[PDB]
Amino acid sequence: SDFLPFSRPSMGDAELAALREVLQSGWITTGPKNQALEEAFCQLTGNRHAIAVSSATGGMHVTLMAMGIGPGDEVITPSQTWVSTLNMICLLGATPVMIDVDHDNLMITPEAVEAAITSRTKAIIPVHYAGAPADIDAIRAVGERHGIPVIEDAAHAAGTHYKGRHVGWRGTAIFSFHAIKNMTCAEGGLIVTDDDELASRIRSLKFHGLGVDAPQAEVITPGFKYNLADINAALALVQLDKLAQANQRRAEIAQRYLRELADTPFKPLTIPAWDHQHAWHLFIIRVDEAACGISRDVLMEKLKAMGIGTGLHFRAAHTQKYYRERFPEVSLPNTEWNSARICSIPLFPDMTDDDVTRVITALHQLS
Amino acid sequence: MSDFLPFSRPSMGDAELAALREVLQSGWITTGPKNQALEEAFCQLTGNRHAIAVSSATGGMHVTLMAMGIGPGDEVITPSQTWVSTLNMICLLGATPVMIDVDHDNLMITPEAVEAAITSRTKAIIPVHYAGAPADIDAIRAVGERHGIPVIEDAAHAAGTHYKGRHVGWRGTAIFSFHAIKNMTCAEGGLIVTDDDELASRIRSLKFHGLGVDAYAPQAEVITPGFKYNLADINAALALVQLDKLAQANQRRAEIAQRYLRELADTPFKPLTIPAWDHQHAWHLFIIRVDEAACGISRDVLMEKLKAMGIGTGLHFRAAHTQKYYRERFPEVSLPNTEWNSARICSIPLFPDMTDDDVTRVITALHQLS
Ligand SMILES: *Cc1c(COP(=O)(O)O)cnc(C)c1O
Ligand SMILES: *Cc1c(COP(=O)(O)O)cnc(C)c1O
Known about the structure:
2 copies of one chain form a homodimer.
Chain A (H helix, E strand, L loop, with lengths): L12 H13 L6 H14 L3 E5 L2 H11 L7 E5 L4 H9 L3 E5 L10 H7 L4 E4 L11 H11 L4 E3 L7 E2 L2 E2 L5 E5 L12 E5 L2 H10 L4 E2 L6 E2 L10 H12 L1 H18 L6 E2 L7 E2 L5 E4 L2 H4 L3 H10 L15 H6 L6 H7 L2 E4 L7 H14 L1
Parallel strand pairs in A: 2-3, 2-4, 5-8
Antiparallel strand pairs in A: 1-9, 6-7, 6-13, 8-9, 10-11, 12-14, 14-15
Helix pairs in contact in A: 1-8, 2-8, 3-4, 3-7, 5-6
One pyridoxal-5'-phosphate binds next to helix 3 of chain B.
EC number (chain A): 2.6.1.87
Enzyme class (chain A): transferase
Family (chain A): Belongs to the DegT/DnrJ/EryC1 family. ArnB subfamily.
């Protein structure tokens, strides 16, 4: 009861009231609340199409499937990301081409993308990491020059702006509504795209391949089941209404960590030089034993003993058994250095000033 | 619309809302203790060893077949007379569905039809427990055993179904659905029961990113790529309430179904036949066959006229092999009992919040439209 986790959702009477309305309606799976959430994300991003899905992982699965990616194709991706993207690429039969990230913001650079392009490349998947945007214009420019789509992993970037627009204003991006995300419906995701044909395929492939060949709907080609229930969509709508205030509070907390950890050896990520608004999904520090007098793993342990949770976002995929053995030649020095040294300290909007003080005090004590 | 009688509606009330409140207050909203409790509850319900909650029965099928190693070059025997999810999952693993016909009066596959379709390439048999009645699973299983072929049961319709005095899935492997129209619901969700330890271990990893502990105790990592089909605790809590309600809900469904059986006996509409083997019917759907020669009206027109009278109906199911992808990929498939029924069935309103007057309304309209 005194434990301070690294994240907790902000669920209250508004969420319970939205659930009451869905239960009372009798329409609990995909329905009007899905449609409302999708319209809301078009209004948020300014992009044309929004497709709600059961998870961002499922969203990535069907987006890559709808693009036709399969055996013989390469997909450029960081290793420094969640394993879902790599797994989906593999489970479509395609080959992930893992590239290194910037050592201080953990995001892929246009130069590293261009160097990895081959005649087999069929997609590039940058990650907007921790709530900051990647330099998406420059990455998009590389893709355009070679005719390669860019699919943005925007799980961390609900409320992120880049050069004055919300992430995903154009192109294709995938958001997550998992429990630790800045807006949550326990599990859920949503794809935005400006590509009409892609949006039509995705919508079918997330609901059994059903489509019209006006004849009744039937399986046009096999698809998966990744639709989002209206129970969950209703929660997501409440949490999107809260997102601006939630991100404001996250930014206040993150600002205080940046300031009060500046005279500690723990090293936050660097803020990108391009114009942006950070959503502050995670507050990551690097723990370099030679600088801090403590290792990353030991810091996490001792914080836990003090009642303070931490997360590891992420253990680089290429270091994990399946990828380590399948892709033994992959050597990504910035990724490997950071992967061994990062952790996420508590950041969520229901944190009080005293919770933040407890974290800062503990880090000063352990340095 | 306020007077519309749909063919199904969930029974959501204060108990469900109080379960949701508890989960939200706890702050643990995705997979957690409610999942574990739901799984334990399904082991106690069925008597089987392992229970794995998933985000849908479709995802359950996907990961179950995947964990069995089903892939290119393997044949999977399945009815066409079922939901398209099973056929789609077979295909999307690269395997080949072998569609067989069903009994003309209960719409379930027979042991004879299974045996006739077995080849050296067959790697699974997927019977469907249809509308709330069980298939003759001992006989189907015996065919599987004789040839060394696993039987994976589609039990989406069979929460509360008994066979020979035990709940469906008491042994073997079976997959339940908690979709909105199923007898217990958490809007979307499912659950796998299995008696196979290794299969259960593989499934648990493949529905959550392939994560596992490597042999030779380290932290979790990707052992082999997996999917994301875990069930949130918000949903698991709803399912727990609906399972607590399932005995009473199924009793009410049986009362309605018995009344339909009796009061449609003097109409030309033809319910499914009740299997001869011993069972307890869950009464997920009340299906009628509408043959224009006998009834004076076609299935499609009956559904349209009922809708005009404020009465909803469903079509469970348009046989998979008649749908574009399968008709064009598998044009050679010819399944006379399936094709005859698929063109003639519909599901009339059956859900436990129906009142006696709702049931009278349906019976009266069917009598009018004969
Ligand atoms: C968790 C995560 C995903 C997958 O999201 P789900 O909603 O859990 O499927 C994808 N990308 C990143 C960066 C993530 O953190
Ligand atoms: C409900 C249904 C399914 C799939 O169920 P979901 O939980 O919606 O994925 C599979 N088989 C049958 C026979 C069904 O009725």
